[PDB]
Ligand binder design. Sequence first.
Ligand code: PJK
Ligand code: NAG
Length: 360
Amino acid sequence: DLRLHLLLNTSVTCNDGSPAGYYLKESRGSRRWLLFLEGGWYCFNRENCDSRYDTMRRLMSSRDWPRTRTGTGILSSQPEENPYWWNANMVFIPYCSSDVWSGASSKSEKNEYAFMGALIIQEVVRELLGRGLSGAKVLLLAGSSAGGTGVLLNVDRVAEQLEKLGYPAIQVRGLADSGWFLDNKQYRHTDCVDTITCAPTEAIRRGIRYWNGVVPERCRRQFQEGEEWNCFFGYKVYPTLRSPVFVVQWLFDEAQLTVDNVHLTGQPVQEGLRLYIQNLGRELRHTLKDVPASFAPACLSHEIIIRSHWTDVQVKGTSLPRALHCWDRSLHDTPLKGCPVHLVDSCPWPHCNPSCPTGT
Ligand SMILES: O=C(O)[C@H]1CCN(c2ccc(Cl)c(C(F)(F)F)c2)C1
Ligand SMILES: *[C@@H]1O[C@H](CO)[C@@H](O)[C@H](O)[C@H]1NC(C)=O
Protein backbone atom coordinates (compact mmCIF):
# COMPACT_ATOMS: atom_id res chain seq x y z
CA ASP A 1 0.00 0.00 0.00
CA LEU A 2 1.03 3.55 -0.85
CA ARG A 3 0.21 6.18 1.78
CA LEU A 4 -1.18 9.62 1.00
CA HIS A 5 0.80 12.77 1.75
CA LEU A 6 -0.90 16.08 0.97
CA LEU A 7 1.61 18.69 -0.13
CA LEU A 8 3.05 20.75 2.68
CA ASN A 9 2.99 23.74 0.35
CA THR A 10 -0.73 24.27 0.28
CA SER A 11 -0.36 26.95 -2.43
CA VAL A 12 0.03 24.03 -4.86
CA THR A 13 -3.49 22.82 -5.36
CA CYS A 14 -5.99 20.71 -7.20
CA ASN A 15 -8.57 22.46 -9.38
CA ASP A 16 -10.80 23.53 -6.48
CA GLY A 17 -8.00 24.83 -4.27
CA SER A 18 -7.70 21.74 -2.07
CA PRO A 19 -4.08 20.62 -1.59
CA ALA A 20 -2.57 18.34 -4.18
CA GLY A 21 -0.50 15.39 -2.97
CA TYR A 22 1.11 12.05 -3.67
CA TYR A 23 0.97 8.47 -2.44
CA LEU A 24 4.30 6.91 -1.42
CA LYS A 25 5.66 3.50 -0.51
CA GLU A 26 9.36 3.66 0.32
CA SER A 27 11.87 0.89 -0.38
CA ARG A 28 14.91 1.70 1.76
CA GLY A 29 18.01 0.43 0.16
CA SER A 30 16.58 1.02 -3.27
CA ARG A 31 17.93 4.04 -5.08
CA ARG A 32 15.31 3.74 -7.83
CA TRP A 33 12.27 6.02 -7.67
CA LEU A 34 9.16 5.67 -9.84
CA LEU A 35 6.90 8.73 -9.94
CA PHE A 36 3.66 7.91 -11.80
CA LEU A 37 1.30 10.54 -13.26
CA GLU A 38 -2.35 9.47 -13.38
CA GLY A 39 -4.53 10.31 -16.40
CA GLY A 40 -8.23 11.00 -16.91
CA TRP A 41 -9.13 13.45 -19.69
CA TYR A 42 -9.04 17.22 -18.95
CA CYS A 43 -11.42 20.15 -19.15
CA PHE A 44 -10.81 23.21 -21.30
CA ASN A 45 -13.58 25.70 -20.32
CA ARG A 46 -15.71 26.62 -17.28
CA GLU A 47 -18.78 24.82 -18.51
CA ASN A 48 -17.10 21.47 -19.02
CA CYS A 49 -15.02 21.83 -15.87
CA ASP A 50 -18.16 22.55 -13.81
CA SER A 51 -19.71 19.34 -15.13
CA ARG A 52 -16.52 17.39 -14.39
CA TYR A 53 -16.59 18.86 -10.86
CA ASP A 54 -20.05 17.53 -10.32
CA THR A 55 -19.51 13.91 -11.37
CA MET A 56 -15.71 13.42 -11.59
CA ARG A 57 -14.71 15.35 -8.50
CA ARG A 58 -11.80 13.12 -7.42
CA LEU A 59 -10.07 14.36 -10.61
CA MET A 60 -10.49 17.97 -9.42
CA SER A 61 -10.11 17.86 -5.65
CA SER A 62 -8.32 15.99 -2.86
CA ARG A 63 -11.22 16.38 -0.41
CA ASP A 64 -12.41 12.78 -0.85
CA TRP A 65 -9.12 10.97 -1.51
CA PRO A 66 -8.50 7.78 0.51
CA ARG A 67 -5.55 7.66 2.85
CA THR A 68 -4.00 4.69 0.99
CA ARG A 69 -3.98 3.05 -2.45
CA THR A 70 -2.72 -0.36 -3.58
CA GLY A 71 0.12 -0.19 -6.09
CA THR A 72 -0.70 -2.17 -9.22
CA GLY A 73 1.12 -3.05 -12.41
CA ILE A 74 4.39 -1.16 -12.62
CA LEU A 75 3.57 0.28 -9.15
CA SER A 76 3.27 -3.19 -7.59
CA SER A 77 5.94 -4.37 -5.18
CA GLN A 78 5.27 -8.04 -6.02
CA PRO A 79 7.78 -9.49 -8.58
CA GLU A 80 5.12 -11.70 -10.14
CA GLU A 81 3.01 -8.63 -10.98
CA ASN A 82 5.96 -6.31 -11.69
CA PRO A 83 9.04 -8.10 -13.03
CA TYR A 84 10.58 -4.75 -13.91
CA TRP A 85 10.83 -2.50 -10.82
CA TRP A 86 9.15 -4.37 -7.96
CA ASN A 87 11.78 -3.19 -5.43
CA ALA A 88 11.63 0.53 -6.32
CA ASN A 89 10.38 3.43 -4.22
CA MET A 90 6.82 3.92 -5.54
CA VAL A 91 4.99 7.25 -5.95
CA PHE A 92 1.50 7.69 -7.42
CA ILE A 93 0.65 11.34 -8.11
CA PRO A 94 -3.14 11.78 -8.50
CA TYR A 95 -4.32 13.85 -11.43
CA CYS A 96 -6.41 16.67 -9.99
CA SER A 97 -5.53 19.57 -12.28
CA SER A 98 -7.44 18.60 -15.49
CA ASP A 99 -4.73 20.26 -17.59
CA VAL A 100 -2.67 17.37 -19.02
CA TRP A 101 -0.12 18.22 -16.29
CA SER A 102 0.68 21.49 -18.11
CA GLY A 103 -0.75 24.24 -15.92
CA ALA A 104 0.92 26.85 -13.77
CA SER A 105 -2.11 29.00 -12.85
CA SER A 106 -3.57 29.45 -9.37
CA LYS A 107 -7.18 29.97 -8.39
CA SER A 108 -7.83 33.66 -7.97
CA GLU A 109 -10.56 36.23 -8.23
CA LYS A 110 -10.12 35.90 -12.02
CA ASN A 111 -9.93 32.06 -12.09
CA GLU A 112 -12.66 29.74 -10.83
CA TYR A 113 -10.19 26.81 -10.91
CA ALA A 114 -6.46 26.36 -10.41
CA PHE A 115 -4.57 24.57 -13.19
CA MET A 116 -1.30 23.64 -11.50
CA GLY A 117 -0.24 20.26 -12.94
CA ALA A 118 3.29 21.34 -13.83
CA LEU A 119 3.75 22.90 -10.39
CA ILE A 120 2.32 19.81 -8.64
CA ILE A 121 5.03 17.70 -10.21
CA GLN A 122 7.74 20.14 -9.19
CA GLU A 123 6.41 20.33 -5.62
CA VAL A 124 6.16 16.54 -5.26
CA VAL A 125 9.77 16.24 -6.39
CA ARG A 126 10.89 18.95 -3.96
CA GLU A 127 9.14 17.34 -0.99
CA LEU A 128 10.41 13.84 -1.84
CA LEU A 129 14.02 15.01 -1.82
CA GLY A 130 13.71 15.19 1.98
CA ARG A 131 12.14 11.69 2.14
CA GLY A 132 14.93 9.79 0.37
CA LEU A 133 14.87 11.02 -3.23
CA SER A 134 18.08 12.99 -2.61
CA GLY A 135 19.88 9.63 -2.59
CA ALA A 136 18.37 8.38 -5.83
CA LYS A 137 20.27 7.04 -8.82
CA VAL A 138 17.32 6.93 -11.22
CA LEU A 139 14.06 8.88 -11.14
CA LEU A 140 11.65 7.40 -13.71
CA LEU A 141 8.80 9.82 -14.36
CA ALA A 142 6.06 7.57 -15.73
CA GLY A 143 2.42 8.22 -16.54
CA SER A 144 -0.60 6.96 -18.42
CA SER A 145 -3.00 8.71 -20.83
CA ALA A 146 -3.04 12.41 -19.87
CA GLY A 147 -0.23 11.43 -17.50
CA GLY A 148 1.76 9.97 -20.41
CA THR A 149 1.56 13.28 -22.20
CA GLY A 150 2.43 14.82 -18.83
CA VAL A 151 5.71 12.88 -18.88
CA LEU A 152 6.59 14.32 -22.28
CA LEU A 153 5.78 17.85 -21.08
CA ASN A 154 7.56 17.60 -17.75
CA VAL A 155 10.46 15.12 -17.78
CA ASP A 156 13.04 17.70 -18.86
CA ARG A 157 11.72 20.19 -16.32
CA VAL A 158 12.22 17.65 -13.53
CA ALA A 159 15.76 17.07 -14.83
CA GLU A 160 16.44 20.81 -14.83
CA GLN A 161 14.90 21.22 -11.37
CA LEU A 162 17.17 18.58 -9.86
CA GLU A 163 20.23 20.03 -11.60
CA LYS A 164 19.47 23.52 -10.30
CA LEU A 165 18.86 22.11 -6.83
CA GLY A 166 22.32 20.54 -6.75
CA TYR A 167 21.46 16.89 -7.55
CA PRO A 168 23.30 16.20 -10.85
CA ALA A 169 23.74 12.47 -10.09
CA ILE A 170 20.04 11.64 -10.27
CA GLN A 171 19.35 10.27 -13.75
CA VAL A 172 15.88 11.47 -14.83
CA ARG A 173 14.09 9.33 -17.41
CA GLY A 174 10.54 9.21 -18.74
CA LEU A 175 8.03 6.43 -19.45
CA ALA A 176 5.09 7.81 -21.45
CA ASP A 177 2.19 5.32 -21.72
CA SER A 178 -0.82 6.05 -23.94
CA GLY A 179 0.11 9.74 -24.23
CA TRP A 180 1.38 9.78 -27.82
CA PHE A 181 -1.43 11.34 -29.88
CA LEU A 182 -1.85 12.41 -33.49
CA ASP A 183 -3.25 15.84 -34.39
CA ASN A 184 -5.16 14.16 -37.19
CA LYS A 185 -8.48 14.74 -38.93
CA GLN A 186 -11.59 13.28 -37.32
CA TYR A 187 -13.34 10.42 -39.09
CA ARG A 188 -16.61 12.39 -38.95
CA HIS A 189 -16.31 16.08 -38.10
CA THR A 190 -17.76 17.44 -34.84
CA ASP A 191 -17.69 20.99 -33.62
CA CYS A 192 -15.76 21.31 -30.38
CA VAL A 193 -18.85 21.26 -28.14
CA ASP A 194 -17.73 19.07 -25.22
CA THR A 195 -14.59 17.31 -24.04
CA ILE A 196 -14.46 13.79 -25.40
CA THR A 197 -15.22 14.38 -29.08
CA CYS A 198 -13.43 17.73 -29.53
CA ALA A 199 -10.80 17.26 -32.26
CA PRO A 200 -7.24 16.95 -30.88
CA THR A 201 -5.84 20.22 -32.25
CA GLU A 202 -8.83 22.24 -31.07
CA ALA A 203 -8.88 20.67 -27.61
CA ILE A 204 -5.24 21.56 -26.95
CA ARG A 205 -5.44 25.01 -28.58
CA ARG A 206 -8.33 25.81 -26.21
CA GLY A 207 -6.79 24.12 -23.19
CA ILE A 208 -3.35 25.66 -23.32
CA ARG A 209 -4.96 29.11 -23.15
CA TYR A 210 -7.47 28.25 -20.41
CA TRP A 211 -4.81 26.48 -18.29
CA ASN A 212 -1.95 28.89 -18.92
CA GLY A 213 -0.20 25.71 -19.98
CA VAL A 214 3.57 25.45 -20.16
CA VAL A 215 5.57 23.30 -22.58
CA PRO A 216 9.24 22.29 -22.79
CA GLU A 217 11.50 25.19 -23.67
CA ARG A 218 13.23 23.78 -26.74
CA CYS A 219 9.89 22.86 -28.25
CA ARG A 220 8.46 26.29 -27.36
CA ARG A 221 11.40 27.95 -29.12
CA GLN A 222 10.58 26.03 -32.31
CA PHE A 223 6.84 26.62 -32.48
CA GLN A 224 6.78 30.06 -30.73
CA GLU A 225 4.04 32.08 -29.12
CA GLY A 226 0.54 31.11 -30.12
CA GLU A 227 1.66 27.71 -31.41
CA GLU A 228 2.76 25.95 -28.21
CA TRP A 229 -0.20 23.54 -28.55
CA ASN A 230 2.07 21.64 -30.97
CA CYS A 231 4.26 20.58 -28.08
CA PHE A 232 1.49 18.38 -26.59
CA PHE A 233 1.89 16.01 -29.59
CA GLY A 234 4.57 13.38 -28.86
CA TYR A 235 5.97 13.18 -32.37
CA LYS A 236 6.69 16.96 -32.31
CA VAL A 237 7.89 17.33 -28.71
CA TYR A 238 9.90 14.08 -28.41
CA PRO A 239 12.84 15.12 -30.69
CA THR A 240 13.32 18.19 -28.53
CA LEU A 241 13.71 16.28 -25.26
CA ARG A 242 17.07 15.50 -23.68
CA SER A 243 16.04 12.95 -21.03
CA PRO A 244 15.72 9.31 -22.18
CA VAL A 245 12.04 8.54 -22.81
CA PHE A 246 10.48 5.14 -23.43
CA VAL A 247 7.18 5.40 -25.32
CA VAL A 248 4.37 2.83 -24.78
CA GLN A 249 1.46 3.34 -27.18
CA TRP A 250 -1.31 1.16 -28.55
CA LEU A 251 -1.48 1.67 -32.30
CA PHE A 252 -5.29 1.99 -32.02
CA ASP A 253 -5.66 3.82 -28.72
CA GLU A 254 -9.29 4.15 -27.69
CA ALA A 255 -8.88 7.75 -26.55
CA GLN A 256 -7.33 8.67 -29.92
CA LEU A 257 -10.31 7.06 -31.66
CA THR A 258 -12.74 8.87 -29.33
CA VAL A 259 -11.30 12.31 -30.11
CA ASP A 260 -11.41 11.22 -33.77
CA ASN A 261 -15.19 10.56 -33.44
CA VAL A 262 -14.87 6.82 -34.12
CA HIS A 263 -17.08 4.48 -32.11
CA LEU A 264 -16.67 0.79 -32.87
CA THR A 265 -20.06 -0.82 -32.51
CA GLY A 266 -19.19 -4.47 -33.05
CA GLN A 267 -21.18 -3.93 -36.23
CA PRO A 268 -19.51 -4.57 -39.59
CA VAL A 269 -16.86 -2.02 -40.50
CA GLN A 270 -17.35 -0.38 -43.90
CA GLU A 271 -14.55 0.54 -46.31
CA GLY A 272 -14.17 4.19 -45.33
CA LEU A 273 -13.77 3.37 -41.65
CA ARG A 274 -11.51 0.40 -42.40
CA LEU A 275 -9.20 2.69 -44.41
CA TYR A 276 -9.33 5.34 -41.64
CA ILE A 277 -8.30 2.84 -38.97
CA GLN A 278 -5.58 1.27 -41.14
CA ASN A 279 -4.13 4.69 -41.92
CA LEU A 280 -4.20 5.67 -38.23
CA GLY A 281 -2.15 2.67 -37.24
CA ARG A 282 0.29 3.24 -40.10
CA GLU A 283 0.71 6.91 -39.12
CA LEU A 284 1.34 5.98 -35.50
CA ARG A 285 3.89 3.37 -36.55
CA HIS A 286 5.59 5.95 -38.77
CA THR A 287 5.94 8.43 -35.91
CA LEU A 288 7.63 5.75 -33.78
CA LYS A 289 10.15 4.56 -36.41
CA ASP A 290 12.94 6.75 -34.95
CA VAL A 291 11.97 6.31 -31.27
CA PRO A 292 14.56 3.73 -30.11
CA ALA A 293 12.84 2.78 -26.84
CA SER A 294 9.21 2.01 -27.55
CA PHE A 295 6.53 -0.64 -27.20
CA ALA A 296 3.59 -0.21 -29.58
CA PRO A 297 1.22 -3.17 -29.92
CA ALA A 298 -1.45 -3.38 -32.61
CA CYS A 299 -4.42 -3.36 -30.23
CA LEU A 300 -7.56 -1.36 -29.68
CA SER A 301 -7.28 -0.61 -25.96
CA HIS A 302 -6.36 2.05 -23.39
CA GLU A 303 -3.51 2.44 -20.88
CA ILE A 304 -1.17 -0.40 -19.92
CA ILE A 305 1.27 0.22 -17.23
CA ILE A 306 -0.70 0.20 -13.87
CA ARG A 307 -3.03 -2.66 -14.83
CA SER A 308 -2.30 -5.81 -12.85
CA HIS A 309 -2.05 -7.88 -16.07
CA TRP A 310 0.30 -5.45 -17.84
CA THR A 311 2.76 -8.36 -18.04
CA ASP A 312 0.70 -10.29 -20.60
CA VAL A 313 1.06 -8.31 -23.84
CA GLN A 314 4.07 -9.04 -26.05
CA VAL A 315 5.43 -7.57 -29.26
CA LYS A 316 7.66 -9.85 -31.32
CA GLY A 317 7.73 -12.21 -28.35
CA THR A 318 8.93 -9.64 -25.78
CA SER A 319 6.81 -8.29 -22.90
CA LEU A 320 6.83 -4.66 -21.76
CA PRO A 321 8.50 -5.48 -18.39
CA ARG A 322 11.26 -7.23 -20.34
CA ALA A 323 11.64 -4.31 -22.80
CA LEU A 324 11.87 -1.88 -19.87
CA HIS A 325 14.56 -4.06 -18.23
CA CYS A 326 16.41 -4.08 -21.58
CA TRP A 327 16.10 -0.28 -21.64
CA ASP A 328 17.66 -0.12 -18.17
CA ARG A 329 20.55 -2.28 -19.40
CA SER A 330 20.97 -0.06 -22.47
CA LEU A 331 21.40 3.01 -20.21
CA HIS A 332 24.21 1.46 -18.16
CA ASP A 333 27.31 3.67 -18.39
CA THR A 334 25.16 -0.88 -29.19
CA PRO A 335 22.14 -3.22 -29.10
CA LEU A 336 21.86 -6.10 -26.66
CA LYS A 337 21.68 -9.77 -27.59
CA GLY A 338 18.13 -11.04 -27.05
CA CYS A 339 17.11 -7.88 -25.14
CA PRO A 340 15.33 -5.52 -27.53
CA VAL A 341 14.01 -2.05 -26.74
CA HIS A 342 12.30 -1.01 -30.03
CA LEU A 343 9.13 -3.08 -30.31
CA VAL A 344 6.52 -1.71 -32.73
CA ASP A 345 3.96 -3.99 -34.34
CA SER A 346 3.71 -3.95 -38.12
CA CYS A 347 0.41 -5.65 -38.60
CA PRO A 348 -2.38 -3.31 -39.73
CA TRP A 349 -5.60 -4.05 -37.77
CA PRO A 350 -6.55 -4.12 -34.07
CA HIS A 351 -5.95 -7.50 -32.43
CA CYS A 352 -3.67 -8.73 -35.20
CA ASN A 353 -1.32 -9.20 -32.24
CA PRO A 354 -2.77 -12.28 -30.45
CA SER A 355 -1.58 -11.02 -27.06
CA CYS A 356 -3.78 -7.91 -27.07
CA PRO A 357 -5.93 -7.40 -23.93
CA THR A 358 -9.08 -9.41 -24.33
CA GLY A 359 -11.41 -6.94 -22.65
CA THR A 360 -12.51 -9.71 -20.25
O1 PJK B 1 -6.38 10.88 -19.99
C1 PJK B 1 -6.92 10.33 -20.96
O2 PJK B 1 -7.69 9.31 -20.85
C2 PJK B 1 -6.73 10.71 -22.49
C3 PJK B 1 -7.87 11.17 -23.07
C4 PJK B 1 -7.30 12.06 -24.33
N1 PJK B 1 -6.15 12.58 -23.78
C5 PJK B 1 -5.25 13.41 -24.56
C6 PJK B 1 -4.03 13.78 -24.02
C7 PJK B 1 -3.17 14.54 -24.79
C8 PJK B 1 -3.59 14.94 -26.06
CL1 PJK B 1 -2.45 15.89 -27.01
C9 PJK B 1 -4.84 14.56 -26.54
C10 PJK B 1 -5.31 15.01 -27.92
F1 PJK B 1 -6.59 14.63 -28.14
F2 PJK B 1 -5.31 16.37 -28.05
F3 PJK B 1 -4.57 14.51 -28.89
C11 PJK B 1 -5.69 13.81 -25.80
C12 PJK B 1 -5.62 11.86 -22.57
C1 NAG C 1 4.82 27.01 -2.76
O1 NAG C 1 4.79 26.91 -4.18
C2 NAG C 1 4.78 28.19 -4.82
C3 NAG C 1 4.54 27.95 -6.29
O2 NAG C 1 5.28 26.84 -6.78
C4 NAG C 1 6.09 28.90 -4.52
O3 NAG C 1 6.07 30.19 -5.13
C5 NAG C 1 6.26 29.05 -3.02
O4 NAG C 1 7.55 29.57 -2.73
C6 NAG C 1 6.10 27.71 -2.31
N1 NAG C 1 6.08 27.88 -0.87
C7 NAG C 1 7.05 27.46 -0.05
C8 NAG C 1 6.84 27.72 1.41
O5 NAG C 1 8.06 26.91 -0.48
